[PDB]
Design a protein around this ligand. Structure first.
Ligand SMILES: O=C1/C(=N\O)c2c(/C=C/c3ccccc3)cccc2N1Cc1cc(F)cc2c1OCOC2
Length: 336
């Protein structure tokens, strides 16, 4: 038999013999791959076909992980199921390179500007590749971003009904207000992350989209009139009748306190980081900086490489099925 089973905490893992000494890291395991002779991460999807939300995402993430090729987006080293037939078909295991930590953990660190900006440079390279392929993520968050000791970074998922068992802090106002979006919907999320790196607190926490929007304008202020104009009457109504805020300026929103700023170098960088933050954390997407300009930004452009920025975009969903059709679709993919 090519497979063996072991329990991890609450779950059974039934994987190829090459993978050993599995350890829980998220449901995901780190493991040693004897064939490649390096460590990998192994994600187990149980019955991803159990419902249309799960099924769509599992399927979508499968097609993409496999035709997208860029160092800032996760790549699959291997996909398998232990089950032998479509009828027996139950689980999917995705195998990728192992890094060292989530972005949440990095975020809890005091980071120099060289690392903070390299991280952000990479997020933007990743997001830029996605967009060139027609993929607007719309749900970048730290928990789907991973980092290696050498500061290298990968985005783990490809972004956006009901389920029976999710973080929206990082979602743009155009997503929250459900209002039509373009590529720079993702700049917003990078900005919440960047902001969170600095302030070390989640920028806009909320029990739900009401809270959340309240947290947004509490600090950035009510959006201008032109922004309201692109809101549905129903949404626009509710938004124009929310209590108003002047807004705080950015030096106030991110005081000098928060910034490495003891050398001249670090003082100039602090100024540059805050300038970029102020350009990303902008409610009106018509005024928010785009991806290309953020890569051009002095804080960011020290890392700029045409190979990483301007890479061939992937050749390539948006669909609906029953449990059984989803199951065969996924099985077909897993088998090729
Ligand atoms: O590097 C990853 C990773 N995949 O590489 C990783 C994954 C991989 C997910 C995945 C998604 C789709 C396909 C294949 C794998 C999930 C969660 C964390 C990951 N981490 C962070 C991580 C690495 C460790 F070696 C140890 C820990 C780490 O984080 C928490 O603390 C313990």
């Amino acid at each position: 038999n090519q497979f063996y089973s072991v329990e991890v905490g609450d779950s059974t893992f039934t994987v190829l013999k090459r993978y050993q000494n599995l350890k829980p890291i998220g449901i995901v395991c780190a493991a040693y791959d004897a064939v490649l002779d390096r460590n990998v991460a192994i994600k187990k999807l149980s019955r991803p076909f159990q419902n249309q939300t799960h099924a769509k995402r599992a399927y979508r993430e499968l097609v993409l992980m496999k035709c997208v090729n860029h160092k800032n987006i996760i790549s699959l080293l291997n996909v398998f199921t232990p089950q032998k037939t479509l009828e027996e078909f139950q689980d999917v295991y995705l195998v990728m390179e192992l890094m060292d930590a989530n972005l949440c953990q990095v975020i809890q660190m005091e980071l120099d500007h060289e690392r903070m900006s390299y991280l952000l440079y990479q997020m933007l390279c990743g997001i830029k590749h996605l967009h060139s392929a027609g993929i607007i993520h719309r749900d970048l968050k730290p928990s789907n971003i991973v980092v290696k000791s050498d500061c290298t970074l990968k985005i783990l998922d490809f972004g956006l009904s009901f389920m029976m068992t999710v973080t929206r802090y990082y979602r743009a106002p155009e997503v929250i207000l459900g209002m039509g979006y373009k590529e720079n919907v993702d700049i917003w999320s990078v900005g919440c992350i960047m902001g969170e790196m600095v302030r070390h607190k989640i920028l806009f926490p909320g029990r739900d989209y009401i809270d959340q929007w309240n947290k947004v304008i509490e600090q950035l202020g009510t959006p201008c009139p032109e922004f309201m104009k692109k809101l549905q009457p129903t949404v626009r109504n509710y938004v124009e009748n929310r209590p108003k805020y002047a807004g705080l300026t950015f030096p106030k929103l991110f005081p000098d306190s928060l910034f490495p700023a003891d050398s001249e170098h670090n003082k100039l960088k602090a100024s540059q980081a805050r300038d970029l933050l102020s350009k990303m954390l902008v409610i009106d997407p018509a005024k928010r900086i785009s991806v290309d300009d953020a890569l051009q930004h002095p804080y960011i452009n020290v890392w700029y490489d045409p190979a990483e920025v301007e890479a061939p975009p992937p050749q390539i969903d948006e669909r609906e099925h029953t449990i059984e059709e989803w199951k065969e679709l996924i099985y077909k993919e897993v088998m090729n």
